[model samples]
Target: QFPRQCATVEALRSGMCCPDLSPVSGPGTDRCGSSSGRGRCEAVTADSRPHSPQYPHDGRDDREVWPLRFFNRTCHCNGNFSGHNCGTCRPGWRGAACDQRVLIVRRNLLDLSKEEKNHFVRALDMAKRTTHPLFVIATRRSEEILGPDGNTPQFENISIYNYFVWTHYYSVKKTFLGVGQESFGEVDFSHEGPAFLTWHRYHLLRLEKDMQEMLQEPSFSLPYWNFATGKNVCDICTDDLMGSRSNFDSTLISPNSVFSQWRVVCDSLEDYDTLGTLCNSTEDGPIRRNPAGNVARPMVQRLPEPQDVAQCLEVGLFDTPPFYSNSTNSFRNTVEGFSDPTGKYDPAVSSLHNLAHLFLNGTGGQVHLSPNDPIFVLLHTFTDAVFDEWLRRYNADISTFPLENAPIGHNRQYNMVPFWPPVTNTEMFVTAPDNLGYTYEIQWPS
Candidate 1:
C-alpha cells in the first residue's frame, strides 16, 4: 500500500491487512479520563455538535447535551443569540444585538497572488486579537456559570457536572476559533495543490474524533462533502456557510491528479467515513516515480524556514493591500471555481498554487500569517510548518507515507498523536495550530 492507504479500505481488503486493534473505544476499553472507570468511551463534549440523543450511534453516551442557547432562523442555536456569546453587549450597540464590529475579510479568490496572500495573513492576526478580549470575557462568564468548586462547598453535588460542562464551553470556544481558522485551510489548499485539502481534513477529523471519545458521544462527528453518500451535500457555489450543502456537487476535481484524492489532498479534511479516501475513487494509478523528484522523498523534509508563531498571530494592525474580489458576491465568492470571478484549475494562478507559494514563504503572499485573520494565519502557520515537518519526516517522498518508512507519530500523511491523555481520537486534542509540537515521527523500522 505504498502511496495508497485508506483506513476504511484497509478494513475491507483482508483480516490480516489492517489493524483490528481499532483505535475506537468499544467493549472493555479505556473511556475518557482514566481517572475514572476506564469504560469504552465514545466522545468528548467538545468533539460533537450535541444533536438529539435519539440518533443511534450518532449521539454520544455518558455525556449530557444541553438546549440550544439561541434559536433563530440561521441556526437553531445561533438564532436565539444575537452577539458573540448570544448576549446583548454594552450600550451604544444600537438595537437588541450582540454589538460588535464583526468584520469578516474574505479571500480574493481570483488571482491569489503573493501580495494577496500576505494581506490575508495579516487579517487573520487581527481576528486573533479581536478574539483575545472575548476569550477573557468568556473565561469570566465561565466562573459565573460553573461556579467555584471548593471542598464541602454548598454546591457540592453539581461541582463535577459543572466542571464537565465547562469543558463543553471551551469546545464552543475552540469551535469558534476553529471556524475562524478554517479559511486558512483554503489558503493552504490554494498552495501545494490538492494534497493540502486532504491533509487539513484529516487533521480536523482527528481533532473532532478525539473530542467525541472524551465526551463519550458520537454526534460530534466531523463534517464532510460526500456527493455519493447523500443528495444535499453539493459543493457551495455561492454561500460561505454552505459548503456541505447538497447542491455544491464538487465530488471530484479535474485532471485527476494524485492530489485529487481525499487522502492525499494537502487541504482535504473529513470525518470517520472519509478517512484514507485519497485513494478511493481516484482517477489515476500510483505514480511510479516521485512527483516532486526531490531527494527528501523517502523521509522527513524540512521547511525552508521556521514558523514564528507569535509573529504570525500578529498579522493584525497591518495595512490592507489592494485585492481582487467580488464584494457584491457573497463571501463564498471568495473561493475559486467556475462561478467565481477567477475560473478554476490553472496551476500558474490557482488558489492552490498561490497558497502553496505562500506556505513556503510564510510571511509574504496571497495567504500568509497576516491575511484573512490571526485565526486563519495561525492554523496555516502550523499547517504549513507541519507540511514542512512532514517533508522532513518522509524525507519528502509521498511514497514514504505508509509501511515502507511510515513516520511513526504524525505527518502531513499521518497524524502525530498528541500528549494529551485518556482520549482515543486525535480530534479531541486539536485546538489551534499554534499548539503544535516538534516531535513529529514516522513508524520507521528500528
Candidate 2:
C-alpha cells in the first residue's frame, strides 16, 4: 500500500513517490523532509528472485510484482529515521533527532495486573474508534482504481484497528482473475508460506506502533497469550480480558464484557470476492467466540502443549523444500501451526498458532477473519516471541532464510504486500529488540 499522499493517478503514472511530511511547503524543504537531512526519495526494487512453480499464473495477479504494479519509488529514510516520509523514528530509536534507545516488551496477558489488563482492553477499543492519521485503503484493485469515469480515486479512510483487520484480509484474499475462472487458492501473500512469521511479526509491530502513537504512549507494548498450556481452554477469555463465553448462547461472547458489544468488520467476505469489490469499513454483528467449541475436530480440542514451543525451536532448518503449508521441519511452518509442533506434517493435527486460533472456533478460526477478534493480536505476539527465540538461538544468520522458491510472496526480497514504504521479508527476519525496536519479556519453559 502506497501512502495516501502519493496514491494519486499522477503519482502512479510518474512511478515516483516522494511523500512530504509537512503540510506547509517552503524554499528550504526537499522531498522526504530533507530539511532534517534524514531521508530522501529513491527507486524501489521488485524482488527478481524466481518463485516456486506451485503458482504458475504470474502476470495474471496484481500482487505478483507487488508494489511495482502500485508504486516504484519511495522514501528511503536514513539513520534510524523511518516512515513514508522521514518524519518519524524507527522502532528502537526515538527522540527529536531519532537517537534514543527505547524498550517495548511484549508480555503474557495472563500475567498482567487487573488494572493493566483493563487499560489494554480500553486501548484496543479506542484504536477501533480512532481513524488512521496518514494512510487510507484502496477499495479497488490497481486496474480499476480510478473508477468508471477515471476521475474517482478508490481509497477510503479506515479506523486503526479495522485497518489491521483489512490488511490481513487483503493479503489472504483470492486472486481476482476475471469472470468464470476460479480464484487461485495457492497464492496467499500472508499465510501458508515462509513469510508467515515475519509477516505476522510486522503486522503486530505495526499495530503496536499505531496504538502507541494513538495513545501517545511511546513505551506501550502489546501482550502475548501463551496458548500452548494444554488446558483445552482459552486462558485470556474472561469477563476481564477478551470476554468469556455466553452461558445462554455458546457462540456469542458474554454480555458482561465490552467485547460483547463490539461488532466485527470484513464479515461480508463472499460479496467482496464474488463481486470483485473490496471490504470497506463496515461493522456488523458481535464477535462470536466459543472456546473449546470445535467438538467435530477432536485433535484441536486441547491447546498445544508447552513442549510444542521447545520442539519447534529445535527445528535446525529454517525452512525446507517447497515451503508451503505442508513443509515439515520448517520452524516457520511449525510455529504457523500448518505442521505439528514437533516438526511433523500431520493432516489431522492443529497445534500452536493454528490450534489456538481454531480453539476460538468462530471469528478467530477463519483464515481471513481471524484478526477481527482482538485476541489475534496477543496470540500472534506469543507466536512471534517463539520465532524471535529461534532466531537468537540460531545466531541470526541470513543464510538460513530461503532466497528462492519460498512461496510466491514469501521470497526474502519480496516487499511485503500492502505495507506503505514497502518492507521486505528478510528485513523482518532479524531479532526484534536488536533490530525491530521491541522485545518480548518471555520466560521459556525448562
What would the per-residue lDDT of candidate 1 be over residues 323-438, giving only the tens digit for each residue? Answer: 11211121111122111222222323222223322322221122211221112222333343334333343333433112111111121222112111112123212222222211
**All candidates' lDDT scores?**
0.22, 0.84
> For residues 1-446, what per-residue lDDT tens digits would candidate 2 score against the true structure?
55777767777677877877663666225678776678888888889888888888878667876788877778899888988888898878889889888877888898898899999999998998889887788888778888897877788888999899998988988877776666667778988888888889889988988999999999899999988789968888898998889888989888898888888878886777766777778789778888888878787678889888878888878887778888888888888888887789978767789989998889998887888899999999999999999989998766757889878888888888877678898889888888888898888876
Prediction 1 TM-score vs. true: 0.21
The candidate that wins on lDDT is 2
Per-candidate TM-score against the hidden true structure: 0.21, 0.96
